[PDB]
Design a protein around this ligand. Structure first.
Ligand SMILES: [Mg+2]
Ligand SMILES: [Mg+2]
Lengths: 151, 152
């Protein structure tokens, strides 16, 4: 149900109310960090633990599952982030207590699914607009908890 | 002098860290195998020895050197091969005893140089026509020896 992960599961099957603006540079650093963690969790060293550094809630559970099954089937992706543009970022307090944030980003990425039985790799490419929900943790760090693809 | 794409990879590493036709599908397999070994030798697992399995002569020496350098700097690349077309391939006799082949291919790839130090990764994207010269070894299979990027 989180954004984009259905495409990668399919690929794995057929192959192998106070609003405040958020700093655009910071919002971009969070996404970039996430993208690079996704690449490594899904990559040949299968760094699954790192997912829990940048993710929480449904994001974590779902991306953790797909990473583990891939490590189980001895497949991995090579991921390249072609383009990243942060469209909007806003912090807010829902029911006060802890803060939440939202980030709309424009992403362009490519990937190869590598299965050793098969010398021809499956290929993935996409450009998309995505909306992220984040929650500031007790440590004061942001983690992505939900994601939604847009039109 | 330099083989294939080597120069560009070194710079982004520096800044941001008589004659018979060959069956085209044989040629397609051989380029895909090499492009796979390159991504694994230059990737996070740093499989340098594996270069010796598909490469020889100047290819092997130059690509091995690049892969050992990236590892020495604790940087790695993620490569994605986006499009591959063999335009032409053929075998020819080389020397008193030896066999060689030429493969001409259109390639499109993308790559990301990963450095733990900075959040942004340098991003490489290219489309090119390349020419490979391979040499059949004492065993059965071919190995890439030289490669020239002719267009873009
Ligand atoms: Mg995502
Ligand atoms: Mg090449």
């Amino acid at each position: 149900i989180v954004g984009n992960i259905k495409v990668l599961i399919d690929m794995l099957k057929m192959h192998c109310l106070h609003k405040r603006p958020m700093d655009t540079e910071e919002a971009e650093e969070l996404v970039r960090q996430w993208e690079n963690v996704k690449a490594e969790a899904l990559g040949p060293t299968h760094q699954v633990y790192s997912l829990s550094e940048v993710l929480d809630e449904s994001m974590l559970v779902q991306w953790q599952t797909l990473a583990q099954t891939a490590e189980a089937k001895s497949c991995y992706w090579r991921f390249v982030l072609l383009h990243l543009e942060v469209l909007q970022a806003h912090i807010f307090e829902d029911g006060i207590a802890g803060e939440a944030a939202e980030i709309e980003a424009l992403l362009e990425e490519a990937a190869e699914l590598v299965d050793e039985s098969q010398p021809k790799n499956a290929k993935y490419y996409s450009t998309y607009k995505i909306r992220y929900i984040l929650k500031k943790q007790e440590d004061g760090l942001w983690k992505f908890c939900q994601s939604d693809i847009q039109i």
